[PDB]
Symmetry: C3
Subunit: 255 residues, 3 copies
């Protein structure tokens, strides 16, 4: 058996909402160390990496390593049948070809069991050589989402320019152009309100806004987001999933 | 004249919202005892019965029995022009054949009058035999609505059964299957939260979820809903309209 | 240079939202005395006049008079990138063919600069003649908006009838008819509920509800609206923009 019980089930709801518009189907790699998923979008512009560590679950059992092929649209539809306060259990019997999802309402005597048909996927995994970035910007996730939404009404590409003291986002199109400058904050009450820049050298890169707007579907997972940038390599947009791991999106820059 | 004054005019707004998507037109039978309406949907799968007793109105006068043919879409449009706190009066002047609606805003100096054209309807209407049911479930209306909504995203038919400690709902379709068990418990704050099951013998029946999702448009009328079930007869879904009567929906089962 | 700083930037957001569906493109006339705009809709049934006086701005400089041709759809898209609490500055360098818009977030270290491309417009500007009105009604803007929305579900034309005691709105269509009467309030000065009538003689006029329902996009600018009416002349629907001026819509009657 594989069995993972998650008291904060809404985490899984949010994870699916953060994946299903970008990726139609993916392999969920289950092992004793937790749940991993890596997948490229169909136009091969971006890659998403999910980690949910075994220790983040309330109980966790994995007797054999699995690669479950999942239609993410189907799994999203099922997770929409869970209430936000539900305890959610994922379960797969060693030799079965389905994934079971159990939703327990904690302040109600309601229990739902869903059985999702799996699919056969040949996914070749790709190694992300780890690296050091020229600029890492940490900022409120809502602010990043608003910026990418607003600029997408101006143009389809955003130039992200980062220096010591601020980050600038600019776009250009038929109606004209726009630039948004966020300065580094000094004094904030809540760390989560900060803008923080760690800069080794300045960078200026161009990215497709449509893809950024897919990424910001993760916004409910975290109050903050980090952008990691170097010349000639993909941007990494990272959302921590507290106690569990993360969702990282990689976006190839424009030439 | 017919004249009926309802201080809680939102009741009528809710009733029309509960009817108009299922039934396009119906006869409103007005007598001294109140308002009665019975109608089949156009595919002859379901029947709806409304009762609003004279004593539930603030004032009520009916000099002669009427059968007013009403386009429910039209009446709904008119009742949408009433505020939720309005006092609503229905009137048919001594020998008119329109229905007049008057909306008085209780905390504002605004009065609206609407005159709705009636239509000629030839309805044969049906005898409801009293019967006893094998299982009668009372449960929170919002929970029933959520269940029917969720399961309709899984399949188009629901199998409803009763265990001695709960009621079960299941559905099956392209993406897989779901099963929901609502169990009884004494740990409720409010009576309206209670699941009550009166069972003479167990039942298992299948019904079209699309029709159930029309019926749950009545959810605003009551915190609770009653399901009455026997083998080989229609399901009855009943919403009490407190102090006034009820809206009952009957649904023919599938084999 | 032209430069106008507005601490209550949401005013400009609200103005564009009030204009852009009715008028696609218009000339913004800039002088030392402030900002003026006048335009007809494409079907030549209505005219809009905007005034924003220089003294309503927090700072205002205009070195030379301008006639900036603006695609309102484009300017709306840009102003939707401003937060509701933003300070908004409009700026145009004497010889440039663009309008700059700067949005400062007051409780955040975020500054946005947008440059909007202008267009060449040949607009003939119309003389508004000498006209004394038979009736002038002041009433809550939200109530006027609700009335025009509700009646547009009954018919496509409203008859507006004004007398000493009240103003009446009526419509007639396929399903029947509706009439709404608003009485003059004795105690007043609560803008959100006061109805006040100044009447030389009673009037009754007919107008196209579809245009009124464009005008009420201005509702957020003011708690109150003023309707000015005489026989055989356009209705004036006026929204005060406190500290600044007004937005006035003129609508030709149906004869
Ligand atoms: Na439970
Ligand atoms: Na009143
Ligand atoms: Na029981
Ligand atoms: Na600031």
């Amino acid at each position: 058996m594989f069995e993972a019980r998650l008291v904060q089930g809404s985490i899984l709801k949010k994870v699916l909402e953060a994946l299903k518009d970008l990726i139609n189907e993916a392999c969920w790699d289950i092992s004793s160390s937790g749940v991993n998923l890596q997948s490229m979008d169909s136009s091969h512009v971006s890659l998403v990496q999910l980690t949910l560590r075994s220790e983040g679950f309330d109980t966790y059992r994995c007797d054999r390593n699995l690669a479950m092929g999942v239609n993410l649209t189907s799994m999203s539809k099922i997770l929409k049948c869970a209430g936000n306060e539900d305890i959610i259990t994922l379960r797969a019997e060693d030799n079965a070809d389905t994934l079971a999802l159990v939703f327990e309402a904690p302040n109600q005597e309601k229990v739902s069991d869903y059985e999702m048909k799996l699919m056969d996927l040949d996914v070749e995994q790709l190694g992300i050589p780890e690296q050091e970035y020229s600029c890492v910007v940490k900022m409120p996730s809502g602010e990043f989402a608003r910026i990418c939404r607003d600029l997408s009404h101006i143009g389809d590409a955003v130039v992200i320019s980062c220096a010591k003291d601020g980050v600038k986002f600019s776009a250009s199109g038929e109606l004209g152009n726009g630039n948004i400058k966020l300065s580094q904050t000094s004094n904030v009450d809540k760390e989560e309100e900060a803008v923080t820049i760690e800069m080794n050298e300045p960078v200026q890169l161009t990215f497709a806004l449509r893809y950024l707007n897919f990424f910001t579907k993760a916004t409910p997972l975290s109050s903050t987001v980090t952008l990691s940038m170097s010349a000639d390599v993909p941007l990494v947009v990272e959302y921590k999933i507290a106690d569990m791991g993360h969702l990282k999106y990689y976006l190839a820059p424009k030439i």
